[PDB]
Amino acid sequence: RPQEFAAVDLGSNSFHMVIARVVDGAMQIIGRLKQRVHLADGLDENSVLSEEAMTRGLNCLSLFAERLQGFSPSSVCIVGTHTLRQATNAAEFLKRAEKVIPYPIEIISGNEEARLIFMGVEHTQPERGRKLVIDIGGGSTELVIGEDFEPRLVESRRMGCVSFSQAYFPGGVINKENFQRARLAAVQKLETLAWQFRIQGWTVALGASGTIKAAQEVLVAMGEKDGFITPERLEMLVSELLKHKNFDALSLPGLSEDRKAVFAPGLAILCGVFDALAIKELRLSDGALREGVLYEMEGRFRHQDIRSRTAQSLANQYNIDREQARRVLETTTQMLEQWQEQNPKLANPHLAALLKWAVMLHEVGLNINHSGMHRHSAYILQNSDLPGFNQEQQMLMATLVRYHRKAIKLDDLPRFTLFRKKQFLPLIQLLRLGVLLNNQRQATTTPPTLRLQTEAHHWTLTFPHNWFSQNALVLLDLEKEQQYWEGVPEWMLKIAEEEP
Amino acid sequence: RPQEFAAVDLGSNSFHMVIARVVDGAMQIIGRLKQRVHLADGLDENSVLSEEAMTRGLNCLSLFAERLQGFSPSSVCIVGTHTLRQATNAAEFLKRAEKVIPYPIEIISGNEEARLIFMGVEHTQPERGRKLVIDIGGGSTELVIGEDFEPRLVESRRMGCVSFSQAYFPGGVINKENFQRARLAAVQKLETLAWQFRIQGWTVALGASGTIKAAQEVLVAMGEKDGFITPERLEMLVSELLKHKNFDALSLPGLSEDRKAVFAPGLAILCGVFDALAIKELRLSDGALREGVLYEMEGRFRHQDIRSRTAQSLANQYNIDREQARRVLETTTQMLEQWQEQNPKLANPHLAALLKWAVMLHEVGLNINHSGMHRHSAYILQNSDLPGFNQEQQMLMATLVRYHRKAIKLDDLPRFTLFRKKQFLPLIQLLRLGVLLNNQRQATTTPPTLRLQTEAHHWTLTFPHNWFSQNALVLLDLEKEQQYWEGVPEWMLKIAEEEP
Ligand SMILES: [K+]
Ligand SMILES: [K+]
Ligand SMILES: [K+]
Ligand SMILES: [K+]
Ligand SMILES: [K+]
Ligand SMILES: [K+]
Ligand SMILES: [K+]
Ligand SMILES: [K+]
Ligand SMILES: [Mg+2]
């Protein structure tokens, strides 16, 4: 039986339990239970947790305990974060919980919390290199810069969307002076770290938790479909926010009812983080504290390049013929480099990387069926949980694979928020030809030279002199592909041989 | 690297190559090449194969050879059938074939051909009992009775759709006298076996190859949706055929152009087989000679109940938690037996078995994602190649799994030729409840008693007295399921506890 374990996050807004089993190097989620306990809402001005909040929390823990019956304590990790760190009657809550759930609650430090969030990012997110990770919680904010599974700068500050609500927006009143007071308070807590962080720098800035997730959802709902948080987009958010007089009137697109009461103080802190660190683009990370517990503390997953780790896992799960993947990769890369030289304005290194991963993974669907494999592979790639690829990157890979066989219908293409069609359409063409030219698998006869010439979507592939006199089946398959391209307006595939 | 091999069938109508690898007890096709060589059309009245037909065959073999470059001879099995048995210059074709493909062609006897067709049926088809297997080819017809991977009676007769075309439909003329002569000629060839076969008997009659496939496709196109071939439906086929004067003029719904010129002689043989053996119902098998070569001669797959063999393969490929399947099976079965005793008219043992297999396989999609698992499992079950399940049975299993979580939309139900909605809808209700009551996996608390009362689609589940005092999470999930049933017209789920 595969190893199973549970990560339990007793946070400021929700109590959240995840149960997973480890199979072939993949973290397979097998259960998830969450309730919006709103524990942070129960902290009064003296940091005493109300009876009402403790009662909601204990009721949630009793449900978790029912689901964890029989689990070894070695397979359960329950962490309490800033709300339980901050509550002066935290011992009372733990006393009650001991009678309800038979696993100890580990109240972790802000340093430990920041490290766990970073580790969840490192185990799951696409971007490699130095990264800035921001998490604005209910009563604490964590900021980390690190790389290669190693935090370098680790900071936590006592500010969050709930604790700033009453302090700076008493009675839930929204005006520019309340907002600016909250925003300047956040900058002041970041004063002593701001330049240290800017000087370390980062390849990407990533955010986690409700406040940042809410900001991303409001922007997307307001038409900014890519979801990146930028200073200009924050300015628009603040302007729409300040058109409301109270939390009760808040009617922003994409703002959930759960987030209405904390969106203004959260947005103030987010603006202060941007002012302090001069962030230009912040992207929401879907991996955070719970993934740090699962991947690092419990699963002990390998510290290696995440996309490669995920690809190795998929090769085991899906019996990937590695020699087939490799010969397709070599052919596709040889043509890609010629296409790139001839079309430097279309060349995109991030898209080129995804084309190569799509080559590695294009046969994952072969265990379902040879018939329609391109669809079955795309189904797996689109719907799986793949560390190292966000949803757009997954959708792009799945799209390249989906289109690598049979009739090409460009009207069925997904809409991408970032990727431009002019830049990934030639990648479909390259994948189709690279797979085709290796479709005899280990029987493939690899041409010693292969020249690609492009004029818009008219492509000429030239093979050695007299090549096809020995490779009639390749030519039949290429002639079929020519008919497929003939079916795409403006496309044309020409096949040629070198002169003697 | 997994075991890999090629099965090559040099038949009367087409030359067909299949290449497959064996992974986790699954036959995974990875290559297929076929050409309609029409080798039997080159046999003259003296059974001499024309050089023109030989050249069509040599061209095809040269393409197969290109795809087989480097294959070990032990990994390639090429079989020749009646056309090469009957040809007086078969040795000439074999000598020429040495120039274009470096693997020997084994010309097999009619009895070995019959046994391989039977073994292909045994390894792939859902019907488990003693079976009659009929294969009407271009110049030979095979008839086998056997069970449990063991032929009991094996026979081949020199009659086929191509050989009977010239002999009884000279010039391609269609009239009742030509047809009757061919039909009686078929009966005459069967006189020496008919009594012996009748005495052995059969649970089911299965047919394979083009003639029988064409008959089924014409019946379906004419409105006989289940595609089963009966004496009454054959009489309709003859009456329609005899309204046409020649092969060129012949036009029937569902008859392809490739089959138009051999449909009348093939149908006459089929009618003669139905007469000689008193067949009342014949179903088309999609497994035959090539599957016998692949599954028996090359793969050497286990002689066991095919559905169980397939399920054990899927359990390995898809990491099925067997204890979870077991507890869901026990719960679903306890409720199924109560529903059956209360609805004996709706009870159906075939559908009941498909429910139990759906239980065993409902988590095959969990490796793709916990999120949407019911859709992912259905995707795998619907699109895989599953020995022991025909297309309709596969779609029924996939449909049960697809509907076992989340909103219930009966208007998206697939239409089945055989299975009636009123009979499988309660199977959806049973699987949903059986999975739900075990959704805490090994932490499940199994009620000592569980009573199901059905009044049409108004179901009452009664749990032990005060049961939910310690199973609050089960009650929450049942209350959600009650909301799901509220969304289906005339459905209602009631939850109760026994009196003290
Ligand atoms: K339980
Ligand atoms: K936080
Ligand atoms: K602080
Ligand atoms: K930035
Ligand atoms: K080759
Ligand atoms: K070769
Ligand atoms: K019968
Ligand atoms: K239990
Ligand atoms: Mg991902």
Author numbering:
A (entry chain A), B (entry chain B): 9 to 508
Task: Cite, word for word, the article reporting this structure.
Degradation of polyP into phosphate is involved in phosphorus cycling, and exopolyphosphatase (PPX) is the key enzyme for polyP degradation in bacteria. The PPX hydrolyzes and releases the Pi progressively from the linear polyP chain. Bacterial PPXs share conserved catalytic domains 1 and 2 belonging to the catalytic N‐domain, and most members of the PPX family contain two additional domains 3 and 4 in the C‐terminal. The exopolyphosphatase belongs to the ASKHA (Acetate and Sugar Kinases, Hsp70, Actin) superfamily protein, which utilizes a common fold for binding and catalyzing hydrolysis of ATP phosphoanhydride.
Protein crystal structures of PPX homologs from different bacterial species, including DrPPX from Deinoccocus radiodurans, AbPPX from Acinetobacter baumannii, and KpPPX from Klebsiella pneumoniae, were determined and refined to resolutions of 1.8‐2.6 Å, respectively (crystallographic data together with the data collection and refinement statistics were summarized in Table  1). While the KpPPX and AbPPX crystallized as a symmetric dimer, the DrPPX crystallographic structure exhibited an asymmetric homodimer. The AtPPX has a ɑ‐linker consisting of 9 amino acids (Gly298‐Ser306), the KpPPX and HpPPX have ɑ‐linkers of 12 amino acids (Ala296 – Gly307, Gly285‐Leu296, respectively), the EcPPX and AbPPX have ɑ‐linkers of 15 amino acids (Ala296 – Lys310), while the DrPPX has a ɑ‐linker of 20 amino acids (Ala300 – Ala319). The shorter α‐linker (AtPPX, KpPPX, and HpPPX) enabled the C‐terminal domain 3 to interact with domain 2 of the N‐terminal, while the longer α‐linkers (DrPPX, EcPPX, and AbPPX) facilitated the interaction of C‐terminal domain 3 with domain 1 and led to a relatively loose dimer formation. Furthermore, we compared the superposition of the protein structures. It was observed that PPXs with similar lengths of α‐linkers presented similar types of dimers: the KpPPX, AtPPX, and HpPPX (9–12 AA in α‐linker) showed a compact dimer configuration, while the EcPPX and AbPPX (15 AA in α‐linker) displayed a relatively loose dimeric arrangement. In terms of the polyP hydrolysis activity of the PPXs, the DrPPX with the longest ɑ‐linker exhibited the weakest activity, while the KpPPX with the shortest ɑ‐linker showed the strongest activity, demonstrating a strong negative correlation of ɑ‐linker length with PPX activity across the species.
